[PDB]
Design an enzyme around this catalytic site. Structure first.
Site, PDB file in Angstrom:
ATOM      1  N   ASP A  96       0.861  -1.164   0.000  1.00 53.66           N
ATOM      2  CA  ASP A  96       0.000   0.000   0.000  1.00 53.66           C
ATOM      3  C   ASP A  96       0.917   1.240   0.000  1.00 53.66           C
ATOM      4  O   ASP A  96       2.087   1.144   0.377  1.00 53.66           O
ATOM      5  CB  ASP A  96      -0.810  -0.050   1.290  1.00 53.66           C
ATOM      6  N   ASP A 140      -0.053   4.968   1.035  1.00 53.83           N
ATOM      7  CA  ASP A 140      -0.221   6.015   2.041  1.00 53.83           C
ATOM      8  C   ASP A 140      -0.129   5.503   3.478  1.00 53.83           C
ATOM      9  O   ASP A 140      -0.858   4.613   3.932  1.00 53.83           O
ATOM     10  CB  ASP A 140      -1.523   6.794   1.789  1.00 53.83           C
TER      11      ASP A 140
HETATM   12 AU   LIG Z   1      -2.429   3.208   3.737  1.00 53.42          AU
END
Ligand SMILES: [Au+3]
Ligand SMILES: [Au+3]
Ligand SMILES: [Au+3]
Ligand SMILES: [Au+3]
EC number: 3.1.3.2
Lengths: 209, 209, 209, 209
Positions: free
Chosen positions: D41, D43
């Site tokens: 992922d 962020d």
């Molecule tokens: Au995230």
């Protein structure tokens, strides 16, 4: 309660607003101060004495707190069961440094008084306290023939009082002595644990052992 | 370093001897004190401004610290890159309470000064600081045409100075102001992290965000 | 060591790479598994027995570890000084849940064997272990007439072994049992404390009391 | 909330039942495994991108979350505001070790897709990811013309997926990949923080920076 509660970094890093101090910081704060009287609570302050209280509860009142009002228990507790009590390292360090300063060392306890007691001897022996700095244990309380802890602190002009319980700190506060908190060990049988720092007092780091 | 280093409960419970305080405790300590001047360092005290410093380093000096002596960097940093700086919650709480007290709020920074700056506006807007309590940012340092941080604290009669760096606390100490430490976030690009509490000063709990 | 060492938020939040588990997680991992044999080390796993070891050291060898080779000490230790040993809450929870599962409960210790022992009784009484689930304490070791801890785990087909010491975990590993670590209390007299997690094993949270 | 709440040593030592792991432990677990696809992922996993989200919220929707549905925001966010995002050290270490293994590196995000994006370039540059190991960012979701995160993990045969959010871990779980959690920084603007460990998954120590 969730099987997998998880955590987060705000929780991991969270600190209670406690004034922590070290033994070295306390000694620095006293540098150049002349000899004075200082005092220590006994149970969970200088001795892990839960072993004797545990044995007492099991022997005299397995299903209640009545053992603590039982003179037969106190006779055992005060005349040899402290052979099983474990001296705390924080207390070794504090007593060594107060002895180095030439301070007078008092112990003040809420234990019920007995005909004789060998606790004073146990303390002087375990902590290597020279007879000149040592004083017999003071059994303080509100029974007839007693003075309260606060009264003894005044009477003996005790300037610093170490202890683990709220009433140790508030006794010091009542007479204008410096009350310094020691952490009660999590395996003590005396529960719940106190909230160390609850009066904004200094609390000694790592003082649970 | 061992693959499985393990741990023990002395380590798990170990505390550094830090005088931690909360915002509520600071406010209590000021109860009944008249309005006064107080001051805040900016970077890692009230703003997480690493985003602009990170961009600056990457743009102007990827392989060194030269960007910090580069006027082209400071012009960007002080005239809009704080749009990306993240205000700290601890600063919101402190500024709100000082505004409530009617205190004068100063910001004093070691950032290099520029022709113009929009940082003062960013601060007043982000922290909702009424114009009456707000003061333009003071760019302090040792360049010609500057006064040092300690001199500004004296000049403005700042009684409390908040900051994350050792030099914030020692500036306060030099003029007899109360220096209070805020924790620098571990994801700051300004490393190493300071030893909060290194002067025996108060350190605000949970102040990394 | 600095008077005011300070700290930082990377240190405050730092975690050792330990596989922590709860009692509820262990029980979940066993859901639907038929009754089996499980085992527990005694000292600092289910009993805080430092009070008796402390008294023993002071009585039989104040200036060494010789008391641990002294049959007179072991006779006292194994025939009544566990009246002063404090049962651990983690052990109460584990034993209760294994008893609920219908598991067979073994205790395996490195204490030196004696003519008689009342430790098995102390354990069954303190932990409320039904006679049907209880087994006499196994005194394991490398003396003639003994089998080692690993051999007993094999012999009794013990599938899970709880303990605080490295040799408890490696005994389990040697026979393909699941070794689960309990934290030794920081006020134990048995030092240094082990590095719980040193083999990548599961370590029970909050298991020092 | 009390002015002086205090604390106790059970609280100081308390641990959540989390399976913590280190980067070195993860790498050991993969020793001798052939090159594979792994995914991250973006962020709060590999970039602290709150600076751009903070600026976006302030610019496009100061009084709501509407900015996150605003194409004008996403065009800025995905085409240069990551110049202000701060790469996480944990991600540097993980990506370096996966590159060393010859693994294929995918990034899968829930950010809204835009006409162009420069995030893939920002990642390859910041993390020194050779073109041979790098793959363009996958914008996953439930909009028409998209596949969900779980579908992309299947499609790309991603064996390990790193992320900070619950939905990162459950995406991995849904396809039988190993989901490994990274801690979201406490100064992220994306709140509340997730409960890392909430699925019994591995959580990387000290991964907030
Ligand atoms: Au995230
Ligand atoms: Au006490
Ligand atoms: Au600063
Ligand atoms: Au043991």
């Amino acid at each position: 309660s969730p099987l997998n509660p998880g955590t987060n970094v705000a929780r991991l890093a969270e600190q209670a607003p406690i004034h922590w101090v070290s033994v070295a910081q306390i000694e620095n704060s006293l540098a150049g101060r002349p000899p004075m009287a200082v005092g220590f609570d006994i149970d969970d302050t200088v001795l892990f004495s839960s072993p004797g209280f545990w044995r007492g509860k099991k022997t005299f009142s397995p299903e209640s707190e009545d053992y603590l009002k039982n003179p037969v228990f106190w006779e055992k507790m005060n005349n040899g069961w402290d052979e099983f009590s474990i001296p705390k390292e924080v207390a070794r360090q504090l007593i060594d440094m107060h002895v180095r300063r030439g301070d007078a060392i008092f112990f003040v306890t809420g234990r019920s008084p007995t005909k004789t007691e060998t606790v004073s001897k146990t303390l002087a022996d375990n902590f290597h306290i020279p007879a000149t700095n040592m004083n017999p244990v003071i059994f303080a309380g509100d029974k007839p023939g007693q003075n309260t802890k606060s009264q003894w602190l005044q009477d003996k002009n005790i300037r610093i009082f170490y202890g683990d319980s709220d009433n140790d700190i508030t006794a010091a506060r009542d007479v204008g002595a410096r009350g310094i908190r020691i952490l009660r060990a999590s395996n003590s049988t005396y529960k719940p644990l106190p909230q160390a720092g609850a009066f904004g007092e200094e609390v000694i780091v790592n003082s649970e052992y």
